Amino acid sequence: RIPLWIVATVAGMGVIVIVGLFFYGAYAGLGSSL
């Protein structure tokens, strides 16, 4: 049994990380302007 509140805060940070990677990609990728 893995405590729910941990499944969440872990899956949670996990999303802020991927969605944050996207925001970084906005000042570097092709979607850049440079």
Binding site: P3, I6, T9, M13
Partner: peptide
């Protein structure tokens, strides 16, 4: 270069200081 090293720790810190309490079971 990669001070993501920082965030990471101070990040698992918040949940830690309650988890250890889930272990020492008490006052949440």
């Amino acid at each position: 270069i990669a001070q993501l090293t920082m965030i990471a720790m101070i990040g698992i810190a918040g949940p830690m200081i309650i988890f250890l309490l889930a272990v020492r079971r008490g006052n949440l």
